[PDB]
Amino acid sequence: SGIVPTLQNIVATVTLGCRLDLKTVALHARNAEYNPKRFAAVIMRIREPKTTALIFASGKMVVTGAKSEDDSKLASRKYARIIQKIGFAAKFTDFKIQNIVGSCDVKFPIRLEGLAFSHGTFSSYEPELFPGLIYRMVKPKIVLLIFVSGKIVLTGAKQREEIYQAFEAIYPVLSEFRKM
């Protein structure tokens, strides 16, 4: 079945070599959130393109909440357009990415306890804290959680490429158990 794994959310952070003041950037915006005893920074919430801008008191910033890779990119400079209103430097250099999460639907019921007994030498699980089986693959050093509904999520990958060739590698051990 030539299905396509969709990707739900990114992370991306950039450095900012300019110092930030929480008074002069939060108190005259629209998405104003600053409770200092609750949290020591500010969240911007714009819903086009539906992503979130997390900042820090030292100046650093990290974006999260986009489906596509370039979807995060176009907002990452629109986010720094608000800090162009205040006379700040906004020195962002490296648009690094270290987490991309993806889910799929493979749509057939499976056993789970057989590969917990067969491939138990590396990956395992428990039922009583969480209903899902956590699967690990050290070949890209990845983690992922599977279900009994045939839905499989992939998280913990820095590079967008690295989810792909891992996702077909886990299929032959998954379709091993046809519940004969």
């Binding site: 005259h28 629209r30 714009i46 629109k78 020195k91």
Partner: peptide
């Protein structure tokens, strides 16, 4: 562009101000 951001401009986030 590390210093520039004025190629992905718009009009509503340009109006995003107090």
């Amino acid at each position: 562009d590390p210093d520039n951001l004025e190629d992905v401009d718009d009009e509503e986030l340009n109006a995003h101000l107090l």
